[PDB]
Design a protein around this ligand. Structure first.
Ligand code: CPS
Ligand code: CPS
Ligand code: CPS
Ligand code: CPS
Ligand code: CPS
Ligand code: SAH
Ligand code: SF4
Ligand code: FES
Ligand code: CYN
Ligand code: FE2
Ligand code: H2S
Ligand code: H2S
Length: 347
């Protein structure tokens, strides 16, 4: 179809596989800009001008899994491993709340040391501060997810990475897409606000795979969707592969907003790493959430999912003020509440 015809169908919410594939296959600048403008408008209409700040504390880089893309994979001996103590984590979260953070995100490698009871105790302490808590700890038994929900966790970010089961198993040899999806369904059933999302430009991933990622996100109606480019890490088996394309990833963000108009969608760290100013662009093409790095030195530099990760060289209180300045210069507004999903029921 022509680009104009594709945009017309997107505006009429006729989200067929062919429409999504054509949107991802057209590279015309005029089409792309019109797609970004549509997503920006849908974002404004459904979720408004507030940009929600989620302060991330990457509290351990120990991991039991061996994902082929990830710098924290267990086979990487070229990385100093660290673990923050529970007291350090709680006090670091307290500092973020003192700086105005309304959500605390705890993210780590799949580090067994904390699971499940240390996490539960940390969550209970942070919840006393009157903020939302999001966990991003990987794949664990239902019993652990249950304990963390009873302890007060509000949300769970478990990006699905890729909806292609063959590619998923090759890149994540300890597990499977089937288990990842089961974890996501369990999280939803337990009442978490649940986040999924994929990487764009993985080795062997096709445009059809990206369409499947979009249809997967639409099918399950996730509360949050985290999308970013694949960034090769020199100490992994994918060191020599090509990085994901920023524009194609941006189109995935924009189409996700169009498909899931009331969802929460971050402008990911990876988007800011791949292109200078990438997060600001993404906030203008469908995203409405930003997640400043709140990991303290000397650990911030060691959470090396991929190289070149932004904000490693800044003072460790720098990122919350920085994103507040970013939101203001974008003409946007601070989030006033926890920024939970506000469902607009449609037809
Ligand atoms: C309008 C002004 C000045 C033109 C002039 O010098 N008179 C020119 C100078 C530099 C140009 C930007 C850069 O090229 C980067 C980027 C390339 C894309 O392709 C199109 C978008 C973008 C943002 C460009 C927009 C615009 O085109 C700019 C601001
Ligand atoms: C800032 C630059 C180009 C600068 C420019 O060229 N214009 C700025 C003011 C100049 N004026 C036209 C007002 C004066 C003309 C008189 S003059 O004689 O000086 O030319 C423009 C050109 C293309 C624009 C992006 C695309 O749309 C896609 C997307 C749409 C979303 O919704 C918002 C985000 C995003 C990324 C846009 C952001 C921004 O907006 C861009 C980069
Ligand atoms: C942590 C220390 C010491 C005092 C303290 O421990 N303060 C707790 C505040 C708790 N809250 C944020 C929930 C209050 C919000 C009240 S508010 O009126 O904003 O709704 C206080 C003293 C001055 C405060 C900064 C400045 O102000 C400027 C700026 C305002 C933004 O906005 C938030 C970010 C920033 C950088 C502030 C961060 C932080 O806060 C500072 C460093
Ligand atoms: C200047 C840098 C590359 C810097 C570099 O690494 N050299 C390139 C890489 C990605 C490019 C943006 C994306 O394409 C999306 C979007 C397409 C619109 O059409 C024009 C505006 C916008 C924001 C583009 C502007 C500009 O062109 C960017 C930032
Ligand atoms: C201390 C740093 C530097 C400056 C730079 C940008 C400033 C924020 C923005 O101006 C937006 C907003 C305006 C409100 O009025 C007060 C709150 C808020 C969040 C400002 C707080 C503070 O002043 C900031 C963080
Ligand atoms: N090389 C790379 N490039 C871009 N993103 C990467 C990456 N390696 C890992 N990531 C992203 O980092 C995210 C958090 S990894 C930490 C949380 C948890 N261990 C988990 O796997 O869910 C992953 O979901 C993945 O999408
Ligand atoms: S993506 Fe998550 S589970 Fe996989 S190696 Fe990295 S930290 Fe471990
Ligand atoms: S958000 Fe980290 S220094 Fe700007
Ligand atoms: C992630 N931001
Ligand atoms: Fe993230
Ligand atoms: S930062
Ligand atoms: S920033």
């Amino acid at each position: 179809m022509t680009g104009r015809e594709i945009l017309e169908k997107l505006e009429r919410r006729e989200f067929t596989r062919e429409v999504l594939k054509e949107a991802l296959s057209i590279n015309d600048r005029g089409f792309n800009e019109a797609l970004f403008k549509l997503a920006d408008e849908i974002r404004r209409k459904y979720v408004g001008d507030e940009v929600h700040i989620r302060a991330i504390i990457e509290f351990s880089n120990v991991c039991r899994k061996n994902c082929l893309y990830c710098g924290l994979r267990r086979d990487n001996k070229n990385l100093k491993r660290y673990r923050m103590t529970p007291e350090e984590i709680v006090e670091r979260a307290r500092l973020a709340v003192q700086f105005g953070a309304k959500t605390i995100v705890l993210q780590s490698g799949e580090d067994p040391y904390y699971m499940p009871d240390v996490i539960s105790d940390i969550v209970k302490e942070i919840k006393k501060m009157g903020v939302a808590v999001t966990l991003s700890l990987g794949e664990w038994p239902r019993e652990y997810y249950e304990k963390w929900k009873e302890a007060g966790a509000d949300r769970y970010l478990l990006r699905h990475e890729t909806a292609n089961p063959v590619l998923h198993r090759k890149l994540r040899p300890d597990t499977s897409f089937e288990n990842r999806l089961n974890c996501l369904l369990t999280l939803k059933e337990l009442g978490y606000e649940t986040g999924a999302g994929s990487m764009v430009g993985l080795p062997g991933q096709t445009i059809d795979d990206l369409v499947d990622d979009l249809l997967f996100l639409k099918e399950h109606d996730f509360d949050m969707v985290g999308i970013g480019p694949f960034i090769p890490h020199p100490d992994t088996p994918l060191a020599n592969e090509k990085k994901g394309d920023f524009t194609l990833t941006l189109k995935m963000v924009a189409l996700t907003r169009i498909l899931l108009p009331d969802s929460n969608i971050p402008a990911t760290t990876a988007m800011g790493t791949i292109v200078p100013g990438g997060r600001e662009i993404t906030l203008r093409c469908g995203a409405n959430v930003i997640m400043p790095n709140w990991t303290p030195s000397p650990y911030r530099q060691l959470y090396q999912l991929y190289p070149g990760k932004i904000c490693v060289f800044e003072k460790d209180t720098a990122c919350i003020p920085c994103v507040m300045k970013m939101i203001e210069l974008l003409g946007r507004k601070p989030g006033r509440d926890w920024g939970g999903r506000k469902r607009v029921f449609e037809t």
